[PDB]
Amino acid sequence: EQFQLRGVLWGKAYSWKITGTTIDKVWSIVGDYVRVDNWVSSVVKSSHVVSGEANQTGCVRRFVCYPASEGESETVDYSELIHMNAAAHQYMYMIVGGNITGFSLMKNYVSNISLSSLPEEDGGGVIFYWSFTAEPASNLTEQKCIEIVFPLYTTALKDLCTHLSIPESSVTLLDD
Amino acid sequence: EQFQLRGVLWGKAYSWKITGTTIDKVWSIVGDYVRVDNWVSSVVKSSHVVSGEANQTGCVRRFVCYPASEGESETVDYSELIHMNAAAHQYMYMIVGGNITGFSLMKNYVSNISLSSLPEEDGGGVIFYWSFTAEPASNLTEQKCIEIVFPLYTTALKDLCTHLSIPESSVTLLDD
Numbered sequence: 318e319q320f321q322l323r324g325v326l327w328g329k330a331y332s333w334k335i336t337g338t339t340i341d342k343v344w345s346i347v348g349d350y351v352r353v354d355n356w357v358s359s360v361v362k363s364s365h366v367v368s369g370e371a372n373q374t375g376c377v378r379r380f381v382c383y384p385a386s387e388g389e390s391e392t393v394d395y396s397e398l399i400h401m402n403a404a405a406h407q408y409m410y411m412i413v414g415g416n417i418t419g420f421s422l423m424k425n426y427v428s429n430i431s432l433s434s435l436p437e438e439d440g441g442g443v444i445f446y447w448s449f450t451a452e453p454a455s456n457l458t459e460q461k462c463i464e465i466v467f468p469l470y471t472t473a474l475k476d477l478c479t480h481l482s483i484p485e486s487s488v489t490l491l492d493d
Numbered sequence: 494e495q496f497q498l499r500g501v502l503w504g505k506a507y508s509w510k511i512t513g514t515t516i517d518k519v520w521s522i523v524g525d526y527v528r529v530d531n532w533v534s535s536v537v538k539s540s541h542v543v544s545g546e547a548n549q550t551g552c553v554r555r556f557v558c559y560p561a562s563e564g565e566s567e568t569v570d571y572s573e574l575i576h577m578n579a580a581a582h583q584y585m586y587m588i589v590g591g592n593i594t595g596f597s598l599m600k601n602y603v604s605n606i607s608l609s610s611l612p613e614e615d616g617g618g619v620i621f622y623w624s625f626t627a628e629p630a631s632n633l634t635e636q637k638c639i640e641i642v643f644p645l646y647t648t649a650l651k652d653l654c655t656h657l658s659i660p661e662s663s664v665t666l667l668d669d
Contacts, residue, residue, distance in 0.1 A: 320571035320590030325550045328576055330583050332609040332620065340668075374501045395496035400504055400626070405669040407506050409626075414496030429605075429624070433508040433667040440615070444508060444667070446622055448605070450576065450585070491609040491620070492516075492581070 327459040328450035330429075331467070332491040333474055335443045337483050340434045343443050344406050346480050347430060350398055351378040356480065357473045362391065374401045377413065385418055392417045399427075406432035419465035424452040444491075445474070503635040506605075506624030507643070508667045509650055513659045516610045516619050520582050522656050523606060523621075526574055527554040532656065533649045538567065550577045553589065561594040568593045575603075582608035595641035599627040620667075621650070 335343065346356050351371045354364040362381045369376030377397045384391055395414035402408065412426045420426060431446040449466050453459075471490075478485050511519065522532045527547045530540040538557045545552030553573045560567060571590035578584065587603040588596055596602055607622040623646050627638050654661050 318569065318590075320544075320553060320573075322544070322551075322553070323573060323575065323587065323589060325575045326585065328585075329578065329581065330605070330607045330622070332607070332622070334611065368496075368498065375498075377496060377498070393494065397496070397499065399499070400502045402505065405505065407669065409502065409504070411499070413499065414494075429506070431506045431508070431622070431624070431669070433620075433669055435667065436510065436665060439510075444609075444620060446506070446508070446607070448607070489612060491611070 324452065326450045327453055327462050328448060329463055329467070330446065330448035331470055332447075333445040334435075334489045334491060335445055335477075335487055336440070336489075337487045338443060338481055339441075340406055340432050340443050342481060343432055343445065343477070344403075346477060347432065347445075348372070348403060348406065348408070350401070350408060350410070351376065353378065353380055357469075357476050358480070359476050360469065360472060367395070368397075372398065372401065372403075374398055379415075382417055392421075394420065420469075422457060423462055423465070424454040424457075426451045501629065502626045503629055503638050504624060504626035505639055505642070506622065506669075507646060508623075508669070509621040510611075510665045510667060511619040511621055511650075511653075511663055512616075512665075513663045514619060514657050515617075516582060516608050518657055519608055519619050519621070519653070520579075522653060523608065524548075524579060524582065524584070526577070526584060526586065527552065529554065529556055533645075533652050534656070535648050535652050536645065543571070544573075548574065548577065548579075550574055555591075558593055565594075568597070570596065596645075598633060598641070599638055600630045600633075601626075601628045603627075 351366040354361045364380035367379040382392045393415040394417040396410045397413045400409040409429045428449045433444040435442045527542040530537045540556035543555045558568045569591040570593040572586045572588045576585040585605045604625045609620040611618040
């Protein structure tokens, strides 16, 4: 009959419905974790595994981002796959190093991706769930975190469409 | 150009499509965190906030479960709300004490609940996302975790239908 308090988290979860595609086609892009450069290609210049085996739980990817502006340098993200279930089209990762703009400011940024198939009778389509959390820290606010993360997720869904060769109208952010 | 490796997690995420209701109606039951007795009433006997303000992040609920099987005694769960966004219909909690059957065996059980609306154009409906993680521990296995958690989530979705007064056929587990 007792308990220990723990700290609270910041974060937010988003869900998109994607039509005119299949969970397999989405996964072939989204699920290739260590090759995120082949997904969010407008932002990420290159990516490769630097610890462990490609796309296996525990592995670490290093990816390089294009400069934010003309004179600036490319920035780098190191992120560890901390859960992977390919059969269930879901995984989870955390940033464990790097100087990637905005994202490297957050304390223990953790992200979850999950894909689901809608019933074929209802027309099919994929539900793309993407969430993040971060630990509260003095140099940020929850709002500032949201302002860092959501525009990238939005860009990523746009880039997904490009790689699927489907129009952007195929993607709808739920509850907007 | 360095990173800090950390441990991996166990867990799984589930999504259901729920028809014949609204996200607001669903949330009136699922979103009342400290009164889970008004939701999973097949399992939970009573529930009350015991730390902080009801349903505010950081608060702790204590709830009592009926005897897991016959002959056995009641068990207790203490869980802390570690993130809450009511307008976005999502929250996160973790077990911080008690001897609740099964769930108290896991190390740092964390659960996420997220509700989304399907487009009105497509008939509406609610997507119910529910995930957990736990930290790997020698005394357990990931399969055991899933055997503990999934039947409870399943029962909770059944109980939800009861309290919404909609048929059990309203709920469909989505293929992952």
